[PDB]
Design an enzyme around this catalytic site. Structure first.
Site, PDB file in Angstrom:
ATOM      1  N   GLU A  35       0.835  -1.195   0.000  1.00 43.35           N
ATOM      2  CA  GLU A  35       0.000   0.000   0.000  1.00 43.35           C
ATOM      3  C   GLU A  35       0.869   1.244   0.000  1.00 43.35           C
ATOM      4  O   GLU A  35       0.611   2.173  -0.754  1.00 43.35           O
ATOM      5  CB  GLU A  35      -0.917   0.052   1.228  1.00 43.35           C
ATOM      6  CG  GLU A  35      -2.124  -0.866   1.169  1.00 43.35           C
ATOM      7  CD  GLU A  35      -3.147  -0.458   0.125  1.00 43.35           C
ATOM      8  OE1 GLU A  35      -2.990   0.612  -0.497  1.00 43.35           O
ATOM      9  OE2 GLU A  35      -4.118  -1.219  -0.082  1.00 43.35           O
ATOM     10  N   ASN A  46      -7.367   9.893  -5.805  1.00 43.26           N
ATOM     11  CA  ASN A  46      -8.205   9.009  -6.606  1.00 43.26           C
ATOM     12  C   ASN A  46      -9.091   9.808  -7.579  1.00 43.26           C
ATOM     13  O   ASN A  46      -9.235  11.029  -7.450  1.00 43.26           O
ATOM     14  CB  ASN A  46      -9.057   8.129  -5.680  1.00 43.26           C
ATOM     15  CG  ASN A  46      -8.214   7.244  -4.791  1.00 43.26           C
ATOM     16  OD1 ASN A  46      -7.424   6.445  -5.273  1.00 43.26           O
ATOM     17  ND2 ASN A  46      -8.353   7.402  -3.496  1.00 43.26           N
ATOM     18  N   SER A  50     -11.056  11.787  -3.769  1.00 40.13           N
ATOM     19  CA  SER A  50     -10.646  11.489  -2.404  1.00 40.13           C
ATOM     20  C   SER A  50      -9.136  11.193  -2.501  1.00 40.13           C
ATOM     21  O   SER A  50      -8.582  11.093  -3.599  1.00 40.13           O
ATOM     22  CB  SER A  50     -11.403  10.291  -1.835  1.00 40.13           C
ATOM     23  OG  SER A  50     -11.038   9.112  -2.510  1.00 40.13           O
ATOM     24  N   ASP A  52      -5.829   8.844  -0.493  1.00 35.51           N
ATOM     25  CA  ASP A  52      -5.441   7.808   0.449  1.00 35.51           C
ATOM     26  C   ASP A  52      -4.196   8.297   1.186  1.00 35.51           C
ATOM     27  O   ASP A  52      -3.253   8.803   0.566  1.00 35.51           O
ATOM     28  CB  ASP A  52      -5.148   6.513  -0.268  1.00 35.51           C
ATOM     29  CG  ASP A  52      -6.285   6.078  -1.144  1.00 35.51           C
ATOM     30  OD1 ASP A  52      -7.444   6.053  -0.699  1.00 35.51           O
ATOM     31  OD2 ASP A  52      -6.017   5.795  -2.310  1.00 35.51           O
ATOM     32  N   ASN A  59      -8.459   6.065   3.188  1.00 37.97           N
ATOM     33  CA  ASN A  59      -9.224   6.980   2.344  1.00 37.97           C
ATOM     34  C   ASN A  59      -9.994   8.113   3.026  1.00 37.97           C
ATOM     35  O   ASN A  59     -10.714   7.885   4.008  1.00 37.97           O
ATOM     36  CB  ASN A  59     -10.181   6.172   1.481  1.00 37.97           C
ATOM     37  CG  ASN A  59     -10.816   6.995   0.392  1.00 37.97           C
ATOM     38  OD1 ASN A  59     -11.977   7.362   0.481  1.00 37.97           O
ATOM     39  ND2 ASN A  59     -10.054   7.291  -0.643  1.00 37.97           N
ATOM     40  N   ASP A 101     -15.294  -3.150   9.955  1.00 41.50           N
ATOM     41  CA  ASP A 101     -16.443  -2.682   9.177  1.00 41.50           C
ATOM     42  C   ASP A 101     -17.277  -3.696   8.401  1.00 41.50           C
ATOM     43  O   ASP A 101     -18.259  -3.317   7.751  1.00 41.50           O
ATOM     44  CB  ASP A 101     -15.990  -1.560   8.232  1.00 41.50           C
ATOM     45  CG  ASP A 101     -17.127  -0.633   7.824  1.00 41.50           C
ATOM     46  OD1 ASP A 101     -17.736  -0.015   8.725  1.00 41.50           O
ATOM     47  OD2 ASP A 101     -17.402  -0.517   6.606  1.00 41.50           O
TER      48      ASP A 101
END
Length: 129
Positions: A35, A46, A50, A52, A59, A101
């Site tokens: 990542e 992105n 947004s 990261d 994000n 989540d």
């Protein structure tokens, strides 16, 4: 700060990520590797506007506030800049919320694509943990 592999593993362990929600330490180190390449200051914008942030590329649409993202929810209740710190505590606490989540580590596209189903134990091999 660009972490060393074993160095990051130890800090993640200290922060309670080993087997957090069923994911061993190798998964978290592998994820960070692909990542951000272990760089706390990594950012990637992105198409949806947004961005990261940090070691785990969290994000701005749902997790943090950067003041420039349409409809951001800021669930981790932190400014995105906090995720770029040399101290990974903010990134770890937020990742704990993300992984809980419902979709687990599939939230991290690099994990799903490059870590999932591989020998993740190799990422902590040789480390004094």
């Amino acid at each position: 700060k660009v972490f060393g592999r074993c160095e990051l593993a130890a800090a993640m362990k200290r922060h309670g990520l080993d087997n957090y929600r069923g994911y061993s330490l190798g998964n978290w180190v592998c994820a960070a590797k692909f990542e951000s390449n272990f760089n706390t200051q990594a950012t990637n914008r992105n198409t949806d506007a947004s961005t990261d942030y940090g070691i785990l590329q969290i994000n701005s649409r749902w997790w943090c506030n950067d003041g420039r993202t349409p409809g951001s929810r800021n669930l981790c209740n932190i400014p995105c800049s906090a995720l770029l710190s040399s101290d990974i505590t903010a990134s770890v606490n937020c990742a704990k919320k993300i992984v809980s989540d419902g979709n687990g580590m599939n939230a991290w596209v690099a994990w799903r694509n490059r870590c999932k189903g591989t020998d993740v134990q190799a990422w902590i091999r040789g480390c004094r943990l």
